[PDB]
């Protein structure tokens, strides 16, 4: 597929949320690194 | 009143003039469109910070890149280097 | 000898083969059941 998620694996996401290290987040679980402020 | 455009000019896939609504990654030079930037094989949408290949007509991902090449031309062997791959840069922002 | 190098990208419990090691970092916490 296009890429994988750290919590799910929604390859149908409009845009992958990538950080400095490379934490590929779909778009939904990516909020965990913002709202919750986790890793 | 003022018109601020800082793109190449014409598309490489369609005949539409590139305006402040391309929303595409910084390719080698010839830029495409937010719709003209799709894989020539799986037709999937590209990612950010990942590797990709540029062809003559369209572009190719990193998923079927090992297939598209062999079915067109270019094989460095089963495990051998056949060439080089590029990484998709940051999406062009109209302002910022 | 020993392991040292984890040449694996697919856990037995999850049974999902990943492609990027960066994604596996967070996966090996919330995805592999619960590695907290
Ligand atoms: Zn997710
Ligand atoms: Zn176009
Ligand atoms: Zn593809
Ligand atoms: Zn797992």
Curated annotation (Swiss-Prot), chain A:
N6-acetyllysine carried by residues: 34
Organism superkingdom: Eukaryota
Span of zinc fingers (GATA-type): 5-29
Region Required for interaction with ZFPM1, annotated ranges: 4-23
Tissue: Erythrocytes. Expressed (at protein level) in liver.
PTM annotation: Highly phosphorylated on serine residues.
Outcome of mutating residue 6 to M: Disrupts interaction with ZFPM1. Binds normally to DNA
Localization in the cell: Nucleus
Domain commentary: The two fingers are functionally distinct and cooperate to achieve specific, stable DNA binding. The first finger is necessary only for full specificity and stability of binding, whereas the second one is required for binding.
Main function: Transcriptional activator or repressor which probably serves as a general switch factor for erythroid development. It binds to DNA sites with the consensus sequence 5'-[AT]GATA[AG]-3' within regulatory regions of globin genes and of other genes expressed in erythroid cells. Activates the transcription of genes involved in erythroid differentiation of K562 erythroleukemia cells, including HBB, HBG1/2, ALAS2 and HMBS.
Subunit (UniProt): May form homodimers or heterodimers with other isoforms. Interacts (via the N-terminal zinc finger) with ZFPM1. Interacts with GFI1B. Interacts with PIAS4; the interaction enhances sumoylation and represses the transactivational activity in a sumoylation-independent manner. Interacts with LMCD1. Interacts with CREBBP; the interaction stimulates acetylation and transcriptional activity in vivo. Interacts with BRD3. Interacts with MED1, CCAR1 and CALCOCO1. Interacts with EP300. Interacts with CEBPE.
UniProt protein name: Erythroid transcription factor
Range of the intact protein held here: 200 to 238 of 413
UniProtKB/Swiss-Prot annotation, chain C:
Localization terms from the record: Nucleus
Ligand binding (Zn(2+) 1): 11, 14, 27, 32
Tissue expression from the record: First expressed in stage 5 at high levels in the primordium of the amnioserosa. Also expressed in germ band extending embryos in cells of the developing anterior and posterior midgut and in hemocyte precursors present in the cephalic mesoderm. In embryonic stage 8, it is expressed in blood cell precursors. By stage 10, it is expressed in hemocyte precursors that have spread throughout the lateral and ventral head mesoderm. By stage 11, it is expressed in the dorsal ectoderm and in precursor cells of the hemocytes and fat body.
Zinc finger regions, CCHC FOG-type: 3-36
Role played: Transcription regulator that modulates expression mediated by transcription factors of the GATA family such as pnr and srp. Represses transcription of proneural achaete-scute complex (AS-C), which is usually activated by pnr. Involved in cardiogenesis, blood, and eye development. During hematopoiesis, it is required to restrict the number of crystal cells, probably via its interaction with the isoform SrpNC of srp. Negatively regulates expression of sr.
Domain notes: The CCHC FOG-type zinc fingers 1, 4 and 5 directly bind to GATA-type zinc fingers. The Tyr residue adjacent to the last Cys of the CCHC FOG-type zinc finger is essential for the interaction with GATA-type zinc fingers.
Assembly notes: Interacts with pnr, although weak this interaction is essential. Interacts with the isoform SrpNC of srp. Interacts with CtBP corepressor.
Family: Belongs to the FOG (Friend of GATA) family.
Protein name: Zinc finger protein ush
Species per Swiss-Prot/TrEMBL record: Drosophila melanogaster (Fruit fly)
Gene: ush
């Amino acid at each position: 597929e296009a890429r994988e998620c750290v919590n799910c694996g929604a390859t149908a996401t409009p845009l992958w949320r990538r950080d400095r290290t490379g934490h590929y987040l779909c778009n939904a679980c990516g909020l965990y690194h913002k709202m919750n402020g986790q890793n | 009143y003022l018109r601020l455009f800082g793109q190449d000019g014409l598309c490489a896939s369609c005949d539409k003039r590139i305006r402040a609504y391309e929303m595409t990654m910084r390719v080698k030079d010839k830029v495409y469109h937010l719709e003209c930037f799709k894989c020539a094989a799986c037709q999937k949408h590209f990612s950010v910070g990942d590797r990709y290949l540029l062809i003559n007509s369209d572009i190719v991902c990193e998923q079927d890149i090992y297939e598209w090449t062999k079915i067109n031309g270019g094989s460095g062997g089963s495990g051998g280097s056949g060439g080089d791959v590029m990484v998709v840069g940051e999406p062009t922002l109209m302002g910022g | 000898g020993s392991l040292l190098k984890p040449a694996r990208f697919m856990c037995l419990p999850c049974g999902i083969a990943f492609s990027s090691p960066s994604t596996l970092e967070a996966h090996q916490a919330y995805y592999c059941s619960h590695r907290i």
